[PDB]
């Protein structure tokens, strides 16, 4: 099973909020230019066809038990020139509202507590070449998942993060049987100081620093049928806590844990590669991957399959994903479903993720 997974704060940043990526197996770093492409790779906002767009995404949690817990997202992108674009997203994971009271009258004042967690990020993407673009994003993360009682403080913990992304999209290249299109992308996410939930100097948790590298190819038939095959590799840039120990008995455990926890994030980025008794073959296990295929008909219907796999010894979150997308006039509706294949219960099972994106403004050509 899972042995010593990496302990990183605000894990809700790693959950796919949009239905398109969640139907493509939680990967969008190299897919086609998309409105939801802020969590995965902002650098393709420069390649968006429409002038501007808004997007609302809903991911219910524990649907059978409670209808309150959810992860919502609101994204807005606007490209001014043909070389640049500004984007801004707001992800909000919420438990709904607990109406705490202590009396029996149906009219006495009740106190509402809504333990939530939201990341508000804004990115600028500039198209350097005609096929390559870069993007820089600044994110503010706030966590208020605690309920204020006696001898407990529920002060919200905040932090900042910097994301650097790049997206390359080649021109339409013809082949023997079809005129495909190549795409590649990389994204380093959540580079920022440790988030401290206790508001104390000693006890701090790393941000979920992430590295996504993906590539994709589009087969184009009749110019109105598309088949995009994408493959993404992902890796966490946070050092892994040691296991048994590298020297009584609790002395070694405490010493190793203290040595691991006294490591800065700047040094932790470099220390991520290795820090294990195993070799490079064992070290390569840390990379998760995801392969997806999306079929587009008339640029208004889309059927997507995806497969996401992590390592057996960490995370252990492997699943298949189905997705469907429809465009009526300017509103694209996306629905995503997840079939788990891991021995651990995925909280996104039996959950139909929803997304609704409006696109408006002038139509920009794509190279």
């Amino acid at each position: 099973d899972i042995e010593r997974p990496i302990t990183t704060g605000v894990p809700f940043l790693l959950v796919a909020a949009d239905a398109r990526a969640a139907g493509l197996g939680d990967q969008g770093v190299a897919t086609s230019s998309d409105v939801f492409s802020q969590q995965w790779n902002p650098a393709k906002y420069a390649f968006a066809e429409d002038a501007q767009g808004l997007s609302i995404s809903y991911t219910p949690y524990l649907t059978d038990l409670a209808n309150d817990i959810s992860l919502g997202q609101v994204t807005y992108y606007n490209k001014i020139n043909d070389r640049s674009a500004f984007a801004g997203s707001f992800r909000y994971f919420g438990f709904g509202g607990i109406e705490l009271r202590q009396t029996g009258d149906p009219n006495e004042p009740t106190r509402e507590v809504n333990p939530n967690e939201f990341a508000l990020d804004g990115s600028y993407s500039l198209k350097l070449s005609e096929t390559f673009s870069m993007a820089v994003a600044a994110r503010y993360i706030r966590s208020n998942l605690k309920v204020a009682t006696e001898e407990i403080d529920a002060s919200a913990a905040g932090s900042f993060a910097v994301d650097v992304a790049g997206f390359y999209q080649s021109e339409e290249i013809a082949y023997s049987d079809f005129n495909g299109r190549w795409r590649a992308g990389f994204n380093i996410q959540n580079l920022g100081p440790k988030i401290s939930y206790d508001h104390d100097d000693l006890s701090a948790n790393f941000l979920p620093a992430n590295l996504r590298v993906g590539g994709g190819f589009d087969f184009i038939f009749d110019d109105y049928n598309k088949l995009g095959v994408s493959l993404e590799l992902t890796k966490l840039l946070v050092p892994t806590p040691p296991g048994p120990g590298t020297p009584s008995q609790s002395q070694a455990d405490e010493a190793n844990y203290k040595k691991y926890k006294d490591i800065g994030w700047v040094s932790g980025i470099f220390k991520s590669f290795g820090d294990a008794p195993g070799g490079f073959s064992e070290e390569l296990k840390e990379i998760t991957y995801s392969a997806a295929a999306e079929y587009m008909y008339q640029d208004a219907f889309a059927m997507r399959l995806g497969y996401y796999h992590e390592s057996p010894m960490k995370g252990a979150k492997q699943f298949f994903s189905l997705g469907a997308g429809f465009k009526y006039s300017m509103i694209k509706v996306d629905v995503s479903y997840l079939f788990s294949a891991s021995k651990v219960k995925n909280p996104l099972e039996n959950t139909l993720r929803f997304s609704l994106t409006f696109n408006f403004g002038d139509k920009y050509e794509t190279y």
């Binding site: 607990i98 009271r101 149906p106």
Partner: protein, 75 residues
């Protein structure tokens, strides 16, 4: 008097005000399902969460067709 859970942040039981039709309350409480499944009646609505743990629990009260869910707080 529609539907009340009077002590929501409780170190004790739940008093569960509701209609006449009996209840089928349950608790899962932070992760997955850990059903308690008591059999609250109309005029004896007292639960027992005093011993389990402390956390934000999920309850699904069932008055027949009146399936009202929510969250309680073990202090």
């Amino acid at each position: 008097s529609d539907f009340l859970v009077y002590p929501n942040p409780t170190k004790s039981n739940i008093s569960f005000l509701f209609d006449n039709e009996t209840a089928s309350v349950s608790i899962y409480s932070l992760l997955g399902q850990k059903l308690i499944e008591k059999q609250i009646t109309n005029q004896n609505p007292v639960l027992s969460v005093e011993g389990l743990t402390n956390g934000l629990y999920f309850y699904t009260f069932d008055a027949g067709s009146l399936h009202k869910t929510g969250k309680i707080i073990k202090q």
